[PDB]
Amino acid sequence: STWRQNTKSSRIEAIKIQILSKLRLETAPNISKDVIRQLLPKAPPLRELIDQYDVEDDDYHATTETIITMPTEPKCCFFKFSSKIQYNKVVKAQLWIYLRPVETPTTVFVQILRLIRYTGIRSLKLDMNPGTGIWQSIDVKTVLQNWLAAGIEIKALDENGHDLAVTFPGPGEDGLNPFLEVKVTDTFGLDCDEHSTESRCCRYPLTVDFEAFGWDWIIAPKRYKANYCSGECEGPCCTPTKMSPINMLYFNGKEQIIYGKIPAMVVDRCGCS
Amino acid sequence: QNTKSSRIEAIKIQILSKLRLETAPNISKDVIRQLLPKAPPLRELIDQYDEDDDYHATTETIITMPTEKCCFFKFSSKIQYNKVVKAQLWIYLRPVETPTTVFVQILRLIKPMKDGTRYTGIRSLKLDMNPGTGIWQSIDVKTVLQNWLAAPASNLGIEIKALDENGHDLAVTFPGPGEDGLNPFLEVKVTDTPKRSRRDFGLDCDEHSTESRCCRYPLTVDFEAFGWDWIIAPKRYKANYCSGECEFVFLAAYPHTHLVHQANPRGSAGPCCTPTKMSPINMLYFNGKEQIIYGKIPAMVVDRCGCS
Ligand SMILES: [Cl-]
Ligand SMILES: [Cl-]
C-alpha cells in the first residue's frame, strides 16, 4: 500500500462528505433496513426508478473572433490561404484601404476588382480635402465566401490621375497597407489498473459500496464506479479534469424519498493542474 | 515560490498549445511596425483593454408517505407551485375474494365553509376487480397540489375511500399486518432550477504571508519580458497560481456526526491544492502567417484555489 492506496482511501472519505454536503444533509439519515421495509412503497413508480439502474465540446483551444490579413509579399494585392475558415461562419468581411492626404481638394474614384479575367465588386466616389489621409472600408462578404468554396486590384485615383491608395507602402507609410477584416463565429486521458507500475498522473478504478458504509438510506445505486486520480506531475498536481453526475434514490430522513442528480461524483479524466 | 517558476513555464506552453502554434511566431518589433495597421478596427480591439450552482444535487422526484385520521401530507419544503411538472396520489386496493365493482373517492379536506361543506371532491373512480391480486391506482392531483403550494395553507388532508359491492373498504390507508409499503403516497415530479450563490470569496492571501494552507498567490505574466512581441494585447495580465497544503478531513459518527481534520505537511498524496475556478483572456496576436488574430483563450486566469 503506497501513496496510491492513501489516495484511494482519501477519495472514499471525500465521496462520503460530498454526498451529504451536495444532498444538503447535516448527518446521514438514521433509517434502518427494518424501517425502510415499512416505508418504501411496493409500487410501480419505485420499481421503475429502481429498474433504471439495470440498463462533446472543445473547452481547451482558443476561439478566433476576428481575423486581419495583410497582403502576401511588384503586384498587389493577394491574400492568405493558410488559416481554415468556413463558407457560412463568416459574419462580416471588410477590405480596408488608406488614401494618402491630398495637396489640393479633388474627387477620388475608388475601384476594387476581383482578379481571375476581371470582375467589378465595388466603385466609390469620394471628396477629399487637404489635411489628412482617410481609411475607407469596403464590404467584401459576398466575394470572400465565393472564394472560400474554391487577388484584389485596388485603385483610388484623384482628378489628376494620381493613385492615392496605399498598396505597397513607401517610406513613412507603416501600418497603412490594405487589409481584410473578417469576423467569424467559430467555437482522451490516461487510464490505469490498480497494480499499474505507471508513475504518471493516471485514472484508477474505484467502486463505492454504500452497503459497506451501512448507508441503507440510499436505495439506489447500491454501488457505483467513482474512480480516482493518482500519479506524478512533472501544474504539479494530479486531479480530475472531467467529472460526471450520478442519479440517486434516497431517504432524506424527513418522511420523504427523493430521486435526484448529484453532480461531479464520477471521475472521467485525470490531468495535471 | 518554485510553484511560480513552473506556472510561468506552463502559461508559455499553454498559450502556444491553445492558440495551435508549434513555435512562437518569429516577428520582430521592426516588422510589427510595418505590418500592424494604424486603422479604426485595430484601434477598437486595442482600446478594449483600457456561479450557477454546479455543486448541490437537483431534485427531480419527491415521494411522500402520510405523516404519523388518514391521510395528511407534510412537505419539508413547499416548492414553488410553477415548478410542479406532475403530482400523483398512489392508492392500493386490496385483493378481492369475489369479482366486484369498486367505487373510489378522493376528497380534499377543507376548513368548514358553514353552508358549503368540509369536503371538496378531487376525483371519483369506478373499476372492476377480479380475484387474484391487489392493484395500484394513481390519481392526478397536480391542480390540488399546485393550489395548496401557492396558498397560505399549512397542511394537506386527503380522505380516501374505495368501497366494493358489499361496503368493505379496499383502500390501504393505515396498513394492517403484512401490508408493508402499501400505504398511500404522493409522487411529485419537479423541475429544480439551480440557485446561484454568486461567488466572491476564496483564500487569496498575499505573497509575504506565512500561510501554509491552499492559497491563491499573485502572478503577472509580462509578454514583453519573454520577448513575445507577436502578442499585441494584452502586454501584461494577472494569471495567479495555487500553492499550499491540503489537510485530510474524515467524516466521523461517534459520539455525534462531525469532521476530523489531520495535517498533511508532507507529500502523503491526499488532497491537493489546485484551481477550482478559471477565467479566459482575449488576445490580439500575430499568428506568423500574414494574419493578426483576436481570440478568446480559456482557463488563463486562476480565480479560486481549492483542495482536490
Ligand atoms: Cl467502498
Ligand atoms: Cl405547470
From Swiss-Prot, chain A:
SUPFAM superfamilies assigned: Cystine-knot cytokines
Protein's UniProt name: Growth/differentiation factor 8
General function of this protein: Acts specifically as a negative regulator of skeletal muscle growth.
Post-translational modification as stated in the protein's UniProt record: Synthesized as large precursor molecule that undergoes proteolytic cleavage to generate an N-terminal propeptide and a disulfide linked C-terminal dimer, which is the biologically active molecule. The circulating form consists of a latent complex of the C-terminal dimer and other proteins, including its propeptide, which maintain the C-terminal dimer in a latent, inactive state. Ligand activation requires additional cleavage of the prodomain by a tolloid-like metalloproteinase.
Family: Belongs to the TGF-beta family.
Transmembrane segments: none
Effect of residue 232 to Q: Slightly decreased SMAD3 protein signal transduction
One function term, GO molecular function aspect: cytokine activity
One GO biological process term: response to gravity
Lineage of source species: Eukaryota, Metazoa, Chordata, Craniata, Vertebrata
Disulfides per UniProt: 192-202, 201-238, 229-270, 233-272
Result when mutating residue 188 to L: Decreases SMAD3 protein signal transduction
Disease per record: Muscle hypertrophy: A condition characterized by increased muscle bulk and strength. Affected individuals are exceptionally strong.
InterPro entries, sorted: Cystine-knot_cytokine, TGF-b_C, TGF-b_propeptide, TGF-beta-rel, TGFb_CS
GO cellular component terms, A-Z: extracellular space
Subcellular location: Secreted
UniProt effect for mutating residue 253 to D: Increases SMAD3 protein signal transduction
Assembly with partners or alone: Homodimer; disulfide-linked. Interacts with WFIKKN2, leading to inhibit its activity. Interacts with FST3.
Pfam family, one: TGFb_propeptide
Swiss-Prot record, chain B:
Gene name of the record: MSTN
Record propeptide residues: 1-199
BP-aspect Gene Ontology terms: cellular response to dexamethasone stimulus; cellular response to hypoxia; muscle cell cellular homeostasis; muscle organ development; myoblast migration involved in skeletal muscle regeneration; negative regulation of insulin receptor signaling pathway; negative regulation of muscle hypertrophy; negative regulation of myoblast differentiation
Disulfide bonds: 205-215, 214-273, 242-305, 246-307
Outcome recorded upon mutating residue 251 to M: Increases SMAD3 protein signal transduction
Major localization listed first in the record, in broad terms: secreted
Compartment(s) where it occurs, according to its Swiss-Prot or TrEMBL record: Secreted
Glycosylation sites (chain numbering): 26
Keywords: Cleavage on pair of basic residues, Cytokine, Disulfide bond, Glycoprotein, Growth factor, Heparin-binding, Secreted, Signal
Consequence when changing residue 245 to Q: Slightly decreased SMAD3 protein signal transduction
The keyword Signal appears for this protein: yes
Purpose: Acts specifically as a negative regulator of skeletal muscle growth.
CDD domains, per the entry: TGF_beta_GDF8
An example Gene Ontology CC term for this record: extracellular space
Quaternary assembly: Homodimer; disulfide-linked. Interacts with WFIKKN2, leading to inhibit its activity. Interacts with FST3.
Entry's disease: Muscle hypertrophy: A condition characterized by increased muscle bulk and strength. Affected individuals are exceptionally strong.
Protein name: Growth/differentiation factor 8
Stored Pfam families: TGF_beta, TGFb_propeptide
Originating organism: Homo sapiens
Post-translational modification: Synthesized as large precursor molecule that undergoes proteolytic cleavage to generate an N-terminal propeptide and a disulfide linked C-terminal dimer, which is the biologically active molecule. The circulating form consists of a latent complex of the C-terminal dimer and other proteins, including its propeptide, which maintain the C-terminal dimer in a latent, inactive state. Ligand activation requires additional cleavage of the prodomain by a tolloid-like metalloproteinase.
Family note: Belongs to the TGF-beta family.
One example GO MF annotation: cytokine activity
Outcome of substituting residue 248 to Y: Increases SMAD3 protein signal transduction
